Amino acid sequence: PSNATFKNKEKPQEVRKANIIAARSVADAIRTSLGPKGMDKMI
Amino acid sequence: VVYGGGAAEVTMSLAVSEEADKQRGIDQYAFRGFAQALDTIPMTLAENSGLDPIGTLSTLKS
Amino acid sequence: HAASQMAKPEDRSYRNYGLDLIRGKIVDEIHAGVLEPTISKVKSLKSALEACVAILRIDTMITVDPE
Ligand SMILES: Nc1ncnc2c1ncn2[C@@H]1O[C@H](COP(=O)(O)OP(=O)(O)O)[C@@H](O)[C@H]1O
């Protein structure tokens, strides 16, 4: 299986990637405001 | 000389891996890290060459 | 004021309190006539706390610009 079936377009691979990144970013802003020793945010 | 195609990276990964459990404590995760990150070289070789990354890794390390 | 905590039941006779500022010496503010109301010091601190509490609970500010 040297030749295989070549996956042509890459935008798929690098869209998902950067989406999870743009999302973990939000799930990160929150980590400070979890549980009893969590902290409040002023918007 | 050493032998490429990942082999060299693999032996190191395996050797650091086995001594990770013998390190223990805080470094136990760092050693595990170092070796696991090394495995990207063979995986991204297998990737570019058109084979399964886990497959080639788990066939090869074993 | 540290002379009222080591002051005995009968020995009160050590208890006194206050401050004067025109002459600049410690005076008996009940005899001097310096008097603030009861609530004026309770609802004074009660509020003062729920202020800094709210501010101390602040760890991230997010400011969003006008419409
Ligand atoms: N006394 C406690 N000690 C440790 N963890 C707690 C205690 N009370 C609640 N928790 C945990 O903290 C979490 C509550 O987080 P909180 O900041 O209130 O937001 P949310 O409840 O929406 O996740 C819960 O998952 C709960 O298991």
User: Which helix H or strand E contains A42, and what residues bound it?
Assistant: strand A40-42
Return the residue of A nearest to C53 by Cα.
A40
Q: Is the CB of A1 under 6 A from ligand 1?
A: no
d(CA C1, CA C17) in angstroms, rounded, equals 7
Q: Which two tokens stand for residue C8?
A: 């005995």
Cα dihedral sign, A5-A8-A12-A13: positive
CA distance B12 to B22: 16
Rounded Cα distance, A32 and C61, in Å: 12
A3 CB neighbours in chain B (<8 A) are: 50
Residues C57, A36: Cα–Cα separation, whole Å: 12
Q: Is the CB of A32 within 6 Å of ligand 1? A: no
What does this entry list as its resolution, in Å?
A: 3.8
Q: ∠ CA(A28), CA(A30), CA(A35), 5° rounding?
A: 125
The H-or-E segment that residue C60 falls in is: strand C58-61
Residue appearing with tokens 């001594």: B19
Residue C59 CB partners (closer than 8 Å, separation 6+):
A32, A33, A39, A40, A41
For residues B28 and B20, the answer to whether their CB atoms sit within 8 Å is yes
How far away is chain A from the Cα of B48, in angstroms, using its nearest Cα? 10
Could you give phi then psi for residue B52, rounded to 5 degrees? -65, 130
Give the ranges where chain C is alpha helix by DSSP (H): 29-32, 39-56
CB of A36 shorter than 6 A to ligand 1:
yes
CB B56 within 8 A of CB B42: yes
Containing A30, the helix (H) or strand (E) segment is none
CA distance C17 to C29: 7
